[PDB]
Amino acid sequence: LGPVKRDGEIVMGVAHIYASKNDTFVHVTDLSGSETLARCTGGIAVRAQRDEATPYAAMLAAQAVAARLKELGVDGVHIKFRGEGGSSRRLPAQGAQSALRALARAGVKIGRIEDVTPLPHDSTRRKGGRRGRRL
Amino acid sequence: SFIKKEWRHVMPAYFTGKHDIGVTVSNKCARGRVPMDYVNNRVWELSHADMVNDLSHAYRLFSWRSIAAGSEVYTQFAGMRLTHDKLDSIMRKYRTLINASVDAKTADGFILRLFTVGFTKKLANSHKNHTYANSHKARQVRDVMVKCLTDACESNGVEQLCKDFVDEKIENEIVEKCKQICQIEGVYITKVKVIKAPALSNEQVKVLKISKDAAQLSL
Amino acid sequence: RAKWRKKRTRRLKRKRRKVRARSK
Amino acid sequence: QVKLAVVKQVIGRTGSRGGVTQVRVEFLDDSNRSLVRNVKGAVREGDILSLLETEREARRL
Amino acid sequence: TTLDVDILHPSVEQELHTNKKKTLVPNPRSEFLSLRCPSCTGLTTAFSHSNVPVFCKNCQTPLATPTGGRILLADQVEIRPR
Amino acid sequence: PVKRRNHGRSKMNRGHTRTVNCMNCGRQVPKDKITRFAIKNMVDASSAKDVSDACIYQGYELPKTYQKQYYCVSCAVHRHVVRPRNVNVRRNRVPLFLKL
RNA sequence: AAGCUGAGGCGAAGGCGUCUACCUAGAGGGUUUCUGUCGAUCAAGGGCGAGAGUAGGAGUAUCCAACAGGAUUAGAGACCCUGGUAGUUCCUACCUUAAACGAUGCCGACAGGAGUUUGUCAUUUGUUAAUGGCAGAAUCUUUGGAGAAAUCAUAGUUCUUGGGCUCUGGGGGAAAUACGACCGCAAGGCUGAAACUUGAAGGAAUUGACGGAAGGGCACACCAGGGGUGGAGCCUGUGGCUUAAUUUG
């Protein structure tokens, strides 16, 4: 129970797919900023830690949200892609594009996909150092 | 679990409408309080394409602060941006990129900071791969970008501005002048951040088509 | 590594300095 | 529950030890779509494969 | 033709193409132009390169104006060879 | 001896240059010394036809991500962005693509 | 101070990237301005000099020598992970070293083509361009000469040996040392031996072999499987122990 729909109207929301190595987030919310059901690979998504970020486990979490959305029930959610933060400069993982596609074939209506990765303008030092990571 | 949270419609045209945009959900007003003691300056973020159902100008983005209401939330110009896809696409190598940040007051009671990005162009007779504008001929353009943008902003009120950002009127008035010096291909107006918004007066309620239900509450 | 050998002598010298002043 | 593909074209072979094929398939359910799935054994074009899960394509090529 | 070049008596092209100093006799590429604004009828001498912006006696506006090289002839103005 | 006239550095006329980072090592390297401008599709390819059923707004253009990539020699070789090659074709300063 | 950002520009080198106003220096070009050899190079002597480091204030977001845990390993004082103070930033004094590298001292002349490119001028309406001039910055080449070779339009014009100045090296260690001095708050810098010791230490390139280097191929090499061996008793071969001999490969 929620929308109190007018009759022949469409209700829209947001996705916020934060895709980063080690985890995936499908934290859907209203445009204003009131959070609806979220979920993620780590929580209800799986187990292990091995397979948090892997694109099956993102695909499982993105059905678990869209179970609820029809129920709430929204309709379609705008998708914004967040990769990772500024110092690292990392763009979204593979687990994004499986999470998006599970919402489509759930199925939930969509539109306006954006990359909202916080990139810096120069700014700060990375981890590691001069030589950086060497493994 | 979720029950008892009161959903409300969202609503100034301006450029288009299709006045209703979306439904935003907060919470029940529990006495001792107004509806406006929730929905406190929430921003929203919408393309031009959402209301007119048209491609073209799909990339441009608009934003509105939650200025007033309780029965139904009414809203006010927060600013503009591009989609990050579009802004990224414009940049090219082997060309002189040109910027111009302008602090500019409107005819009405906003204060704005506008931005822009403009590139040089090769054309016809030049065979070389890279054309670079001179420091002087780049600084000539920044004067043209400021002067056109600051004058066109200053003269007109803010509904005309927000129409002209869709119509790309100010874009074309720049390339007029540049033909004389540097051709400059590209030219987009990127951002306009609202620094100092007008406070909610009863004259502004009469302008923006905000109902009697709102100004009873939030004043 | 020559760098290190250099570091070792720097150290070696600083010790002979110490011992010597023991006796100024 | 127990859906039925059929092999349009064998693109090639894969795995570390060359153990498995992978194949373009068009669903026999008739909903339509093409899925790129890794099969185990040996596959002649036009063969029918039963998939517990219709979702997820394999990885890359 | 690296080996044979005739350098005592070169072409009229090649003297103009080579540098001011590099010619067989060194001498400059710059002369005193006569000038006239169509307003006046007074015929004014000037140095083509200049440094100083040129006026006639009568008017007020400079006849020629200074750049790096040759003088920049402002307005419709003309040259009588003398 | 000198392997390259360049010395692996593309800088002439200047004593100093800025540093960047390979995306993988995170290593600090001068800018002068393995960049790629990289356009990938944001959805995918096989995902895209499943999406365009469920799209609000008809037709639409599904956007592309852009990324300027900086590596470093150690990182570049491991990923097969660059490899070593024969002493004669080291000089070859054009990329693989070729046109008429 | 991303992207623009390049074998692009400026600066004596170290080095220098948002925009605005402010004070300041100069290279290159043009010049029928002026002076008239005022110059080249340099022991001493004088300044500038990455990053680290030091002293005293002002900061302290990020990252982080040390340090503390966690993993891995035989051990791990490390590589990987989570935290972390000194430092990293500004101001006033210091220190004076780097693969401070074009590992190529400075000024001067001449010797070959080719097209790039930065600044600026010249003759043209090919005017954000064409051809040519000086000054930069690189490049290419079936060119000449040089070099041990790699290679180099300078590393050419050198037994066909001499344009002018300065500094350095004289087999390898011992020795970025010792002693003595000067400079330094200190860390150190700078100048710089001998006893003794040794037959090589090095440079470039070729042929192999090798790589937990890359790319091509292959086979019971694995994959999928089938049947065994390793356990039990016995037959035989070999090591051990035994013996006069347990003949021997």
Tab-separated table of N, CA and C in Angstrom, chain B residues 69-179:
chain	number	residue	atom	x	y	z
B	69	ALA	N	4.016	24.159	0.211
B	69	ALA	CA	2.838	23.268	0.142
B	69	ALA	C	2.713	22.203	1.230
B	70	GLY	N	1.544	21.569	1.239
B	70	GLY	CA	1.173	20.505	2.176
B	70	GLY	C	0.162	19.504	1.640
B	71	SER	N	-0.949	20.006	1.100
B	71	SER	CA	-1.856	19.199	0.270
B	71	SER	C	-1.157	18.625	-0.964
B	72	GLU	N	-0.309	19.441	-1.588
B	72	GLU	CA	0.359	19.083	-2.833
B	72	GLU	C	1.585	19.974	-3.012
B	73	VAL	N	2.770	19.367	-3.079
B	73	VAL	CA	4.030	20.118	-2.969
B	73	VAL	C	4.327	20.931	-4.245
B	74	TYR	N	4.471	22.248	-4.075
B	74	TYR	CA	4.832	23.171	-5.159
B	74	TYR	C	6.295	23.578	-5.038
B	75	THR	N	6.893	23.956	-6.168
B	75	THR	CA	8.351	23.952	-6.322
B	75	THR	C	8.872	25.119	-7.167
B	76	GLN	N	10.185	25.331	-7.084
B	76	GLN	CA	10.841	26.562	-7.527
B	76	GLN	C	12.188	26.224	-8.161
B	77	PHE	N	12.645	27.069	-9.084
B	77	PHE	CA	13.833	26.784	-9.899
B	77	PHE	C	15.083	26.622	-9.034
B	78	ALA	N	15.676	25.428	-9.085
B	78	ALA	CA	16.925	25.110	-8.380
B	78	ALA	C	18.154	25.223	-9.282
B	79	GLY	N	18.018	24.823	-10.545
B	79	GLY	CA	19.061	25.057	-11.545
B	79	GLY	C	18.976	24.170	-12.775
B	80	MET	N	20.122	24.004	-13.430
B	80	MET	CA	20.254	23.196	-14.638
B	80	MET	C	21.548	22.394	-14.567
B	81	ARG	N	21.568	21.246	-15.232
B	81	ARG	CA	22.823	20.606	-15.622
B	81	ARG	C	22.629	19.771	-16.885
B	82	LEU	N	23.725	19.237	-17.419
B	82	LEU	CA	23.659	18.166	-18.418
B	82	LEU	C	23.686	16.799	-17.749
B	83	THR	N	23.281	15.783	-18.506
B	83	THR	CA	23.698	14.410	-18.242
B	83	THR	C	25.202	14.274	-18.471
B	84	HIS	N	25.842	13.434	-17.663
B	84	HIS	CA	27.300	13.300	-17.670
B	84	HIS	C	27.814	12.647	-18.957
B	85	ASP	N	27.015	11.740	-19.523
B	85	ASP	CA	27.221	11.219	-20.886
B	85	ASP	C	27.409	12.317	-21.937
B	86	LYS	N	26.486	13.272	-21.954
B	86	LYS	CA	26.517	14.375	-22.907
B	86	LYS	C	27.684	15.333	-22.746
B	87	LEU	N	27.989	15.695	-21.508
B	87	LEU	CA	29.088	16.610	-21.249
B	87	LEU	C	30.420	15.988	-21.638
B	88	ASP	N	30.577	14.709	-21.319
B	88	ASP	CA	31.791	13.963	-21.627
B	88	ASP	C	32.012	13.833	-23.127
B	89	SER	N	30.922	13.627	-23.851
B	89	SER	CA	30.960	13.458	-25.297
B	89	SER	C	31.496	14.670	-26.039
B	90	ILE	N	31.161	15.855	-25.550
B	90	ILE	CA	31.575	17.100	-26.180
B	90	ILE	C	33.084	17.314	-26.258
B	91	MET	N	33.814	16.953	-25.211
B	91	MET	CA	35.258	17.161	-25.202
B	91	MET	C	35.972	16.390	-26.307
B	92	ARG	N	36.953	17.039	-26.926
B	92	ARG	CA	37.729	16.457	-28.014
B	92	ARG	C	39.193	16.825	-27.881
B	93	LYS	N	40.079	16.039	-28.485
B	93	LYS	CA	41.511	16.361	-28.424
B	93	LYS	C	41.924	17.188	-29.646
B	94	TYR	N	43.095	17.813	-29.563
B	94	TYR	CA	43.645	18.660	-30.633
B	94	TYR	C	42.780	19.897	-30.948
B	95	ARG	N	42.151	20.457	-29.917
B	95	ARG	CA	41.324	21.661	-30.038
B	95	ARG	C	41.465	22.492	-28.764
B	96	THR	N	41.422	23.816	-28.889
B	96	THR	CA	41.461	24.697	-27.716
B	96	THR	C	40.083	24.764	-27.050
B	97	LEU	N	39.967	24.122	-25.890
B	97	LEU	CA	38.781	24.208	-25.028
B	97	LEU	C	38.744	25.573	-24.328
B	98	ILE	N	37.546	26.157	-24.212
B	98	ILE	CA	37.356	27.513	-23.664
B	98	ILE	C	36.200	27.552	-22.654
B	99	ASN	N	36.480	28.021	-21.437
B	99	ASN	CA	35.482	28.122	-20.366
B	99	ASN	C	35.175	29.566	-20.009
B	100	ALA	N	34.039	29.782	-19.346
B	100	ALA	CA	33.666	31.110	-18.850
B	100	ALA	C	32.613	31.033	-17.744
B	101	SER	N	33.074	31.042	-16.495
B	101	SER	CA	32.189	31.128	-15.334
B	101	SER	C	31.754	32.575	-15.105
B	102	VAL	N	30.448	32.776	-14.940
B	102	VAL	CA	29.859	34.106	-14.771
B	102	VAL	C	28.923	34.087	-13.568
B	103	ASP	N	29.219	34.923	-12.573
B	103	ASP	CA	28.239	35.309	-11.558
B	103	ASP	C	27.361	36.429	-12.109
B	104	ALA	N	26.049	36.195	-12.128
B	104	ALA	CA	25.104	37.063	-12.834
B	104	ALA	C	23.750	37.078	-12.126
B	105	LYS	N	23.291	38.273	-11.758
B	105	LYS	CA	21.928	38.469	-11.261
B	105	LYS	C	20.937	38.514	-12.425
B	106	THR	N	19.718	38.040	-12.172
B	106	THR	CA	18.622	38.100	-13.148
B	106	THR	C	17.925	39.463	-13.113
B	107	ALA	N	16.935	39.638	-13.988
B	107	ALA	CA	15.992	40.761	-13.901
B	107	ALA	C	15.138	40.699	-12.630
B	108	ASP	N	14.611	39.510	-12.337
B	108	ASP	CA	13.957	39.220	-11.049
B	108	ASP	C	14.994	38.806	-9.976
B	109	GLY	N	14.540	38.239	-8.853
B	109	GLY	CA	15.315	38.249	-7.605
B	109	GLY	C	16.229	37.060	-7.328
B	110	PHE	N	16.503	36.232	-8.338
B	110	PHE	CA	17.559	35.209	-8.243
B	110	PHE	C	18.954	35.833	-8.275
B	111	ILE	N	19.939	35.080	-7.786
B	111	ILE	CA	21.333	35.216	-8.217
B	111	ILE	C	21.822	33.860	-8.729
B	112	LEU	N	22.481	33.879	-9.888
B	112	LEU	CA	22.912	32.667	-10.588
B	112	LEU	C	24.427	32.656	-10.766
B	113	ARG	N	24.996	31.454	-10.869
B	113	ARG	CA	26.314	31.252	-11.477
B	113	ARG	C	26.193	30.327	-12.682
B	114	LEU	N	26.401	30.888	-13.873
B	114	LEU	CA	26.341	30.140	-15.132
B	114	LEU	C	27.743	29.734	-15.582
B	115	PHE	N	27.813	28.647	-16.351
B	115	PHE	CA	29.062	28.145	-16.924
B	115	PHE	C	28.884	27.867	-18.409
B	116	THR	N	29.988	27.571	-19.086
B	116	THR	CA	29.956	27.161	-20.491
B	116	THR	C	31.255	26.465	-20.910
B	117	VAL	N	31.177	25.702	-21.997
B	117	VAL	CA	32.351	25.085	-22.616
B	117	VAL	C	32.251	25.200	-24.139
B	118	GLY	N	33.306	25.721	-24.766
B	118	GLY	CA	33.337	25.961	-26.212
B	118	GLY	C	34.684	25.608	-26.820
B	119	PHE	N	34.652	24.936	-27.968
B	119	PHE	CA	35.857	24.461	-28.647
B	119	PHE	C	36.069	25.230	-29.941
B	120	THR	N	37.319	25.281	-30.400
B	120	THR	CA	37.646	25.746	-31.751
B	120	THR	C	37.234	24.709	-32.799
B	121	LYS	N	37.228	25.114	-34.070
B	121	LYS	CA	36.978	24.189	-35.183
B	121	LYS	C	37.978	24.372	-36.322
B	122	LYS	N	38.420	23.251	-36.890
B	122	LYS	CA	39.028	23.232	-38.219
B	122	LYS	C	37.958	23.442	-39.289
B	123	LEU	N	38.365	23.984	-40.435
B	123	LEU	CA	37.450	24.207	-41.556
B	123	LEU	C	38.200	24.324	-42.882
B	124	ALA	N	37.919	23.400	-43.805
B	124	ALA	CA	38.185	23.563	-45.246
B	124	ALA	C	39.673	23.729	-45.587
B	125	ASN	N	40.189	24.947	-45.439
B	125	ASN	CA	41.490	25.316	-46.006
B	125	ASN	C	42.684	24.841	-45.167
B	126	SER	N	42.507	24.770	-43.845
B	126	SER	CA	43.537	24.228	-42.948
B	126	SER	C	43.633	22.704	-43.075
B	127	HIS	N	44.805	22.223	-43.493
B	127	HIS	CA	45.083	20.787	-43.617
B	127	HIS	C	45.619	20.176	-42.323
B	128	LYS	N	46.268	20.967	-41.475
B	128	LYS	CA	46.830	20.408	-40.241
B	128	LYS	C	45.793	19.840	-39.277
B	129	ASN	N	46.178	18.765	-38.599
B	129	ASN	CA	45.309	18.056	-37.664
B	129	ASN	C	44.821	18.828	-36.446
B	130	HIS	N	45.686	19.633	-35.850
B	130	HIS	CA	45.297	20.367	-34.659
B	130	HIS	C	45.285	21.876	-34.808
B	131	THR	N	44.167	22.493	-34.450
B	131	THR	CA	44.053	23.940	-34.500
B	131	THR	C	43.917	24.424	-33.068
B	132	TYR	N	44.834	25.284	-32.634
B	132	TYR	CA	44.794	25.796	-31.271
B	132	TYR	C	44.632	27.303	-31.234
B	133	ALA	N	43.658	27.763	-30.464
B	133	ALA	CA	43.417	29.185	-30.315
B	133	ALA	C	44.531	29.816	-29.487
B	134	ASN	N	44.874	31.051	-29.818
B	134	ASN	CA	45.905	31.786	-29.109
B	134	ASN	C	45.390	32.195	-27.733
B	135	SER	N	46.290	32.526	-26.813
B	135	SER	CA	45.875	32.916	-25.467
B	135	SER	C	44.997	34.155	-25.535
B	136	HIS	N	45.380	35.079	-26.404
B	136	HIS	CA	44.647	36.326	-26.657
B	136	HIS	C	43.294	36.046	-27.313
B	137	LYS	N	43.308	35.235	-28.367
B	137	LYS	CA	42.083	34.853	-29.085
B	137	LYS	C	41.191	33.875	-28.310
B	138	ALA	N	41.736	33.236	-27.276
B	138	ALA	CA	40.927	32.554	-26.259
B	138	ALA	C	40.328	33.535	-25.252
B	139	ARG	N	41.112	34.532	-24.836
B	139	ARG	CA	40.631	35.565	-23.905
B	139	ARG	C	39.646	36.549	-24.548
B	140	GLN	N	39.731	36.712	-25.866
B	140	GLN	CA	38.701	37.422	-26.638
B	140	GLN	C	37.326	36.743	-26.546
B	141	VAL	N	37.327	35.411	-26.555
B	141	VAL	CA	36.099	34.612	-26.517
B	141	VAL	C	35.435	34.656	-25.138
B	142	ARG	N	36.236	34.561	-24.079
B	142	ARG	CA	35.726	34.664	-22.703
B	142	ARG	C	34.971	35.970	-22.442
B	143	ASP	N	35.437	37.065	-23.037
B	143	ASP	CA	34.710	38.339	-23.006
B	143	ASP	C	33.375	38.261	-23.750
B	144	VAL	N	33.372	37.611	-24.912
B	144	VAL	CA	32.149	37.416	-25.707
B	144	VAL	C	31.159	36.477	-25.003
B	145	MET	N	31.677	35.420	-24.380
B	145	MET	CA	30.850	34.474	-23.616
B	145	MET	C	30.249	35.097	-22.357
B	146	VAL	N	31.041	35.889	-21.633
B	146	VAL	CA	30.550	36.626	-20.463
B	146	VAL	C	29.487	37.645	-20.879
B	147	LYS	N	29.844	38.522	-21.817
B	147	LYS	CA	29.052	39.716	-22.146
B	147	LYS	C	27.674	39.380	-22.718
B	148	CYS	N	27.622	38.388	-23.606
B	148	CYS	CA	26.355	37.889	-24.153
B	148	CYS	C	25.482	37.237	-23.081
B	149	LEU	N	26.106	36.394	-22.263
B	149	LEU	CA	25.408	35.622	-21.237
B	149	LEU	C	24.916	36.499	-20.080
B	150	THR	N	25.770	37.410	-19.611
B	150	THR	CA	25.424	38.306	-18.500
B	150	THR	C	24.375	39.362	-18.875
B	151	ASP	N	24.392	39.822	-20.128
B	151	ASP	CA	23.417	40.808	-20.613
B	151	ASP	C	22.045	40.179	-20.873
B	152	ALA	N	22.042	39.016	-21.524
B	152	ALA	CA	20.806	38.277	-21.814
B	152	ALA	C	20.114	37.754	-20.549
B	153	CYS	N	20.910	37.327	-19.569
B	153	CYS	CA	20.405	36.995	-18.233
B	153	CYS	C	19.804	38.209	-17.522
B	154	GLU	N	20.578	39.291	-17.445
B	154	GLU	CA	20.205	40.492	-16.681
B	154	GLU	C	18.895	41.132	-17.156
B	155	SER	N	18.662	41.106	-18.467
B	155	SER	CA	17.524	41.798	-19.073
B	155	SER	C	16.209	41.056	-18.827
B	156	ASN	N	16.201	39.756	-19.115
B	156	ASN	CA	14.982	38.945	-19.055
B	156	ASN	C	14.743	38.346	-17.670
B	157	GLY	N	13.476	38.061	-17.370
B	157	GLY	CA	13.095	37.284	-16.191
B	157	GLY	C	13.300	35.794	-16.395
B	158	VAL	N	13.101	35.026	-15.325
B	158	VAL	CA	13.677	33.674	-15.213
B	158	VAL	C	12.909	32.588	-15.998
B	159	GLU	N	11.621	32.817	-16.269
B	159	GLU	CA	10.845	31.949	-17.176
B	159	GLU	C	11.323	32.008	-18.628
B	160	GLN	N	11.767	33.188	-19.056
B	160	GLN	CA	12.356	33.370	-20.385
B	160	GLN	C	13.715	32.674	-20.494
B	161	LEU	N	14.531	32.791	-19.444
B	161	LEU	CA	15.808	32.063	-19.338
B	161	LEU	C	15.631	30.553	-19.486
B	162	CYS	N	14.713	29.993	-18.703
B	162	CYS	CA	14.488	28.543	-18.672
B	162	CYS	C	13.844	27.999	-19.954
B	163	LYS	N	13.145	28.865	-20.690
B	163	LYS	CA	12.702	28.557	-22.054
B	163	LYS	C	13.864	28.591	-23.054
B	164	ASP	N	14.735	29.594	-22.930
B	164	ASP	CA	15.870	29.781	-23.850
B	164	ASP	C	16.974	28.720	-23.730
B	165	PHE	N	17.103	28.095	-22.558
B	165	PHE	CA	18.024	26.962	-22.381
B	165	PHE	C	17.584	25.708	-23.146
B	166	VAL	N	16.274	25.518	-23.302
B	166	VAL	CA	15.736	24.494	-24.208
B	166	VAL	C	15.927	24.922	-25.668
B	167	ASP	N	15.601	26.180	-25.970
B	167	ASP	CA	15.644	26.697	-27.344
B	167	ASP	C	17.055	26.986	-27.878
B	168	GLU	N	18.077	26.920	-27.013
B	168	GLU	CA	19.472	27.285	-27.338
B	168	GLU	C	19.605	28.613	-28.109
B	169	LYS	N	18.943	29.642	-27.583
B	169	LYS	CA	18.986	30.993	-28.146
B	169	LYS	C	20.312	31.696	-27.846
B	170	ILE	N	20.835	31.486	-26.638
B	170	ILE	CA	22.049	32.172	-26.172
B	170	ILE	C	23.293	31.528	-26.792
B	171	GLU	N	23.247	30.206	-26.964
B	171	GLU	CA	24.211	29.454	-27.784
B	171	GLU	C	24.487	30.103	-29.148
B	172	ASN	N	23.423	30.353	-29.910
B	172	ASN	CA	23.542	30.890	-31.274
B	172	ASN	C	24.005	32.349	-31.333
B	173	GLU	N	23.627	33.144	-30.332
B	173	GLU	CA	24.057	34.546	-30.234
B	173	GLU	C	25.557	34.714	-29.946
B	174	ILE	N	26.198	33.680	-29.394
B	174	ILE	CA	27.661	33.657	-29.246
B	174	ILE	C	28.360	33.442	-30.598
B	175	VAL	N	27.878	32.476	-31.381
B	175	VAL	CA	28.578	32.026	-32.600
B	175	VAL	C	28.458	33.056	-33.736
B	176	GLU	N	27.399	33.867	-33.695
B	176	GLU	CA	27.358	35.201	-34.327
B	176	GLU	C	28.693	35.961	-34.254
B	177	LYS	N	29.087	36.334	-33.042
B	177	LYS	CA	30.308	37.107	-32.797
B	177	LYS	C	31.634	36.424	-33.120
B	178	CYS	N	31.723	35.145	-32.793
B	178	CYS	CA	32.941	34.374	-33.008
B	178	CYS	C	33.340	34.224	-34.466
B	179	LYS	N	32.373	34.300	-35.363
B	179	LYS	CA	32.670	34.130	-36.770
B	179	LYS	C	33.725	35.166	-37.130
